[PDB]
């Protein structure tokens, strides 16, 4: 799981999760990762360098393999150029004349047979592509929502954890904008998933504590100076 944890996944939200499903050869499960190179990577399926998600893959020799030859699975071996990340190529053109024999057919088939041991057995791959960002979250975990309180409590808006106060904002958030960001790259306003109102996120009250005390050899009584904070706060 790139960028996410396999166990700490039911407590976050996502924008749109896409499950890429494909079966590759056993020994060919090395290029399903960001920045990898090879035949399946450069010609069949390429992952971007900024990939985020779990590349789930397991053995499927008992399902996608037959002794008589399971030739219904193909793979592209030849191509004019390298494949871009998240690109599909289903063309059956010959990589010359109209037919092959001299140029060859780029759509070869796997010899999936139970006789072939590990490395040549089919492997099912489920690429759960995740995109966790400032986009409005449409899919979340099984966690239940609590009542909303305003005016110093901990908040959790679509997985965004933090601590601060909530106040009625006068901003003009757009329908496609869910989170706000200040100069310090922190969240200053957030849109509630249930109600479409915008609430500002302001940290709770704080301040320096300077202690005014004479020498210990004189007395033990001390004074406290809450610098930057008014007496009414």
């Amino acid at each position, epitope marked *: 799981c790139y960028g996410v944890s396999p166990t700490k996944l039911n407590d976050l939200c996502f924008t749109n999760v896409y499950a890429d*499903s494909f079966v590759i050869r056993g020994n060919e499960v090395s290029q399903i990762a960001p920045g990898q190179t090879g035949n399946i990577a450069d010609y069949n399926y390429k992952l971007p360098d900024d990939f985020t998600g779990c590349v789930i893959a397991w053995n499927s020799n*008992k399902l996608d393999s037959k002794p*008589s030859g399971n030739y219904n699975y193909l793979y592209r071996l030849f191509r004019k150029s390298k494949l871009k990340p998240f690109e599909r190529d289903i063309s059956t053109e010959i990589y010359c004349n109209g037919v092959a024999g001299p140029c060859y057919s780029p759509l070869q088939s796997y010899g999936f047979r*139970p006789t072939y041991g590990v490395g040549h057995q089919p492997y099912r791959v489920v690429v759960l592509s995740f995109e966790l960002l400032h986009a409005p979250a449409t899919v979340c975990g099984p966690k239940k929502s609590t009542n909303l309180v305003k005016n110093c409590v901990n908040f959790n808006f679509n997985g965004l954890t933090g601590t601060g106060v909530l106040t009625e904002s006068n901003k003009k958030f757009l329908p496609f904008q869910q989170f706000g960001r200040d100069i310090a790259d922190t969240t200053d306003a957030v849109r509630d998933p249930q109600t479409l109102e915008i609430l500002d996120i302001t940290p709770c009250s704080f301040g320096g504590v300077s202690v005014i005390t004479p020498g210990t050899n004189t007395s033990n009584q001390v004074a406290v100076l809450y610098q930057g904070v008014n007496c009414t706060e």
Partner: antibody
Framework: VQSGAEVKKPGESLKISCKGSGYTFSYYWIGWVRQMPGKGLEWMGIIYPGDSDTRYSPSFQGQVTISADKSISTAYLHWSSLKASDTAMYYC??????????????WGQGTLVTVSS | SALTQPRSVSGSLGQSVTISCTGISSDVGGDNYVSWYQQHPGKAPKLMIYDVSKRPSGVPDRFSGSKSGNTASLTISGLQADDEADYYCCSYALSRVVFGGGTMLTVLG
């Protein structure tokens, strides 16, 4: 050729069998499908000749178990605490090289188990 | 889901008959998970139509199928006397085998 169906009472743990031929019992899926008098076929589950990764139907998870014999290529079924509604024609089917692993290529003969008192 | 089929049909000698099949589901990987089985009354069932885009071995060419959304049809031509048997459509898209409500083929003459 299959064994006969002896009249049994609910709770005697009867057994059925079927004989197949024309393949190798090494990597071809095989299962059992019943058919009650007056209704269609009902898929129960399948078993693999090697590691028995059995996958039973949701309506047959704890009602019947597969106990097929691999050394003689003869399928068998085991029951426990049967009911009166278990009277059905059990058909043995295998994967076959025609379709996928779940597709049934060939079928057995079928024996109609009868339950009465 | 449960596959819905007509309980009884009435064909004719030399004519054709189309058995419907609805309620077929689909999963990621394809939508052609449709297969038919031929079971004679009191005899052993035999695989007749599977992967309608293809043709099984040993099955006569007078049997074919089609797909239209979630509804499938079994086109059978050249009805004869020995063609009287039960037919069921199957769906195995979600790794689960389901059968229809049963179809009885009757011919007139």
């Amino acid at each position: 050729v299959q064994s006969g169906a002896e009249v049994k009472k609910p709770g005697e743990s009867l057994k059925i069998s079927c004989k197949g031929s024309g393949y190798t019992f090494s990597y071809y899926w095989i299962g059992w499908v019943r058919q009650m008098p007056g209704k269609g076929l009902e898929w129960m589950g399948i078993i693999y000749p090697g590691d028995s990764d059995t996958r039973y139907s949701p309506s047959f998870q704890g009602q019947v178990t597969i106990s097929a014999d691999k050394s003689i290529s003869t399928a068998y079924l085991h029951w426990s605490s049967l009911k009166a509604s278990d009277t059905a024609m059990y058909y043995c089917a295998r994967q076959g090289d025609l379709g996928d692993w779940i597709l049934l290529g060939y079928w057995g003969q079928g024996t109609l188990v009868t339950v009465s008192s | 889901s449960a596959l819905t089929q007509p309980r009884s049909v009435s064909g004719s000698l030399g004519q054709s008959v189309t058995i419907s099949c609805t309620g077929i589901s689909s999963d990621v990987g394809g939508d052609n998970y449709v297969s038919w089985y031929q079971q004679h009354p009191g005899k052993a069932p035999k695989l007749m139509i599977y992967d309608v885009s293809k043709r099984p071995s040993g099955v006569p060419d007078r049997f074919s199928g089609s797909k239209s959304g979630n509804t499938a049809s079994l086109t059978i031509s050249g009805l004869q006397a020995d063609d009287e048997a039960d037919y069921y459509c199957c769906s195995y898209a979600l790794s689960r085998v389901v059968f229809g409500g049963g179809t009885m083929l009757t011919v007139l003459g």
